[PDB]
Write a protein that binds this DNA or RNA. Structure first.
Ligand code: MG
Length: 179
RNA sequence: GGUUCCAUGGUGUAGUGGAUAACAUAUCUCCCUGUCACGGAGGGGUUGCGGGUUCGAUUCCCGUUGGAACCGCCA
């Protein structure tokens, strides 16, 4: 990606100067964006889960692996050995492609993207974005599951400090309130 | 003293071999009638206590209460 090379040059220079980092790779580096569109309807409407996967596939270019619960609950109708939820973890070129596509196409189409930040870092440098609806994503046709759901896009970084993660986010211009 | 059975709606009783609780009376609302009873329509209301097993107990297991049914002899 041309923006990937732009990321290289720009992130290196500003970050290096911003904290006098003694090495170019001391600057934070983003690793992997997990997407987890999971639903318990597979306990009853198994069909739905299948469609779920395809949409997830259609969004990232990686086929989603379906995850299984590690316990069993009667109230939730849960039982061990069943597949409830798919997770995809993008890396390399595809992860940066999805990140740019999200921030530039999907996110500003959000009904009311006022944003949320500073109050999202887990204290170790991660970040989770809770999407409310799937239809807003461009890689989705109107025909879909009878139920509509959101997403749990998350982020990782090489650093362990949440403040430096915020600094990388600002350098990348991820558009949130004051952050 | 010991042994078998039972505890389900307000009252009388069925079910459940773990995933679910009905019948009648009674109760409420509305037709009905001068009025009321009877009648007609509709509505509503449930596992003795505890503690384990199971993802899940009214049901399966062991204890604790209450009510019954049987026995407690030979000198
Ligand atoms: Mg005698």
């Amino acid at each position: 990606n041309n923006l990937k090379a732009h990321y290289q040059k720009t992130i290196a220079k500003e970050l290096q100067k911003s904290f006098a980092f003694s090495s170019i790779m001391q600057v934070p580096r983003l690793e992997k964006i997990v997407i987890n569109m999971g639903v318990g309807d597979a306990i009853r409407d198994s069909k739905f889960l299948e469609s779920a996967l395809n949409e997830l596939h259609l969004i990232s270019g990686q086929k989603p692996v379906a995850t299984k619960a590690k316990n069993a609950i009667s109230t939730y109708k849960l039982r061990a050995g069943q597949l409830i939820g798919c997770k995809v973890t993008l890396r390399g070129e595809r992860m940066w492609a999805f990140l740019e596509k999200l921030i530039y196409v999907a996110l500003p189409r959000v009904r009311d993207f006022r944003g949320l930040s500073l109050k999202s870092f887990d204290g170790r440098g991660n970040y989770t974005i809770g999407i409310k609806e799937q239809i807003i994503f461009p890689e989705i046709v109107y025909d879909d599951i009878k139920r509509i759901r959101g997403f749990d896009v998350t982020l990782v970084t090489s650093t362990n400090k949440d403040s430096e993660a915020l600094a990388l986010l600002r350098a990348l211009n991820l558009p949130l309130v004051k952050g």
